[PDB]
Design a protein around this ligand. Structure first.
Ligand code: HEC
Length: 108
């Protein structure tokens, strides 16, 4: 484990063909296949603006952090067994660390 930080614009071009198909991260961004992500960092799992999660995502209530959300992205299915996050998981750490650097820099 060594968060060798990436580039917020590599994380952007990654996000744009990994997560944008289901999620939003600008604060005007409507919820869709999943919630918005703008303000997840420092929240618990399951707290977007009036949006209904799963029983498993709620009973998880993970404090979304730099390290803690990187764990979840490695295998979201195992981390929240029953999650609506149909995705699969970002196997490669380097490619995660870029996306983290973006999503963080889209929250502050
Ligand atoms: C559509 C098939 C999805 C893709 C592609 C990605 N995500 Fe996802 N995510 C999805 C859902 C429907 C949910 C809610 C799960 C539930 O069962 O209620 C989520 C949740 C997240 C969260 C947590 C939000 C919160 O707890 O408030 C994060 C931080 C998140 N997702 C990040 C994320 C990233 C960065 C993705 C690209 C690698 C990505 N998701 C793809 C659905 C889908």
């Amino acid at each position: 484990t060594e968060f060798k930080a990436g580039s917020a614009k590599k994380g952007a071009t990654l996000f744009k063909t990994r997560c944008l198909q289901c999620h939003t991260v600008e604060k005007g961004g409507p919820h869709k296949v999943g919630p918005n992500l703008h303000g997840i960092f420092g929240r618990h799992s399951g707290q977007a603006e009036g949006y209904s999660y799963t029983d498993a995502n709620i009973k998880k209530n993970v404090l979304w952090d730099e390290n803690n959300m990187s764990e979840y992205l490695t295998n979201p299915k195992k981390y929240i067994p029953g999650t609506k996050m149909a995705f699969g998981g970002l196997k490669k750490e380097k490619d995660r660390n870029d996306l983290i650097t973006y999503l963080k820099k889209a929250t502050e």
